[PDB]
Amino acid sequence: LSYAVNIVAALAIIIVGLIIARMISNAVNRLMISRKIDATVADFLSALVRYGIIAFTLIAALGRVGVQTASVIAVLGAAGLAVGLALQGSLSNLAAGVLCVMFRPFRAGEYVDLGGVAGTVLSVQIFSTTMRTADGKIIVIPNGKIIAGNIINFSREPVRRNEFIIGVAYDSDIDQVKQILTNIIQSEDRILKDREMTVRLNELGASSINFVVRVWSNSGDLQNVYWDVLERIKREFDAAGISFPYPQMDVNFKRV
Template sequence: MQEFNVINNINYVRNWVENHQKILLKYIIHIISAIIIIITGIFSSRIISKIFHTILHNRKIDNTISDFLIMISKYIIITTTIIITLGSLGIQTTSIIAILGAAGMAVGLALQGSLSNVAAGVLLIIFSPLRIGEYVVFKNIAGTVLKIHVFYTTLKTLDGKIIIIPNNKITSNNIINYSREPCRRNEFIINVSYDANVDLVIKILKDVMYNEPRVLKDKDIIVGLNKLEFYSMNFIARCWSNTNILNTVYWDLMIKFKQALDDNNIILPYKKLNVYINKKKYNKK
């Protein structure tokens, strides 16, 4: 009796398979294609991650940011692969995409500030308005860039303070980069007495700059009378030097300007307050 039931079951299965061959073949093809899509997606995510890592490494992107971008790209590929796989199995993915979109929007609204910092960090890396080691100024903040993180950038001020700034605060303001150009111009304001000869003052200031070896001679060296103040003539002297020694050249030239003007008996005026006492009026009292 049991053998008869087994034979009946086998015959039933065989008949069912014969009657549903097209459906079974269709599902088998769907399953095989889904497996192929999953394997392709996994390998693609690994290959693209390696290529992305190589590109970011060649551009000397910070490891924290590069790892974050690689992780995001990997998850995007995997999510896309899963959706395509479900679609190949005949499952309607429209509702799934809608749910993922709603979830993404909710997460985006909840993490709006953090995501804006991440986006700003990516923009700072891609467009490089500032790099590690450069001296920058934005708003009332100035310092040397120590590190560009995913969410914030670290600066070190000239007096040794560490400033941590959210990235979206940087990209939303004007950035002044003092280190990007290899050479920059110094500007000096020199006040001299009205008794001085204008041509002589111009010659002295120019000679000082031309005799300074750190001043770039292939750039403009300019001296001119800029303004007539109440108590002095205001001269402006301009010259160029390498950015890394700009301040040192400025300080040394200021000393040499003073010494050269003193050697030629040209007075550097200063404000004075004269007090007169009426002796007659004082004696009467």
């Protein structure tokens, strides 16, 4: 049984191969990390060399025990293929992960809409991103889904814009409405005066004349500015004699 020495040689090749592979791959993503690339892309690109070198080792090692070479390429091919399928979704998500962290279309703490759902971003991880809905629900979105959909970011821009739509009665003084509204926004300090300040008759409506007011503020103020400016419009308009109309209807009577 002097051809049972190849069994021992097969092992030798595997152990030497496993080590030679482990040390090259370590010594490659030592190189990559020292350049800059990116921790994950390093580990990934690296772990391909690793699994590649032990793929060569398996071919030559089995090969000394008469395993036909072109059967190892085939079996390992299949093996790899079966893994490949099972993972993929992951691989795809893993990649989106990188992209998101290395392009920061949103960063942790920004409020964003990631395709129907919107919340404050907490953390982008390997496969999935975590946000917290204004009301306290937690949503976990797959990195893959995020990256191939639109990213609406409420917070990256420093100055944003409220739009009021106020409806008043048809017999209201057009000039009077404009003046009161203009004088409300003029006096509000939180409204940026060096930007758009549109007060205008916008829509001849169903039962109301509809005025549009659009004014810019710092992103932080936007919410409070809206509320404060509204309370105001309502108060002033009442004291000034302008009517917010209920729904109207001309009825045309007929005794029968």
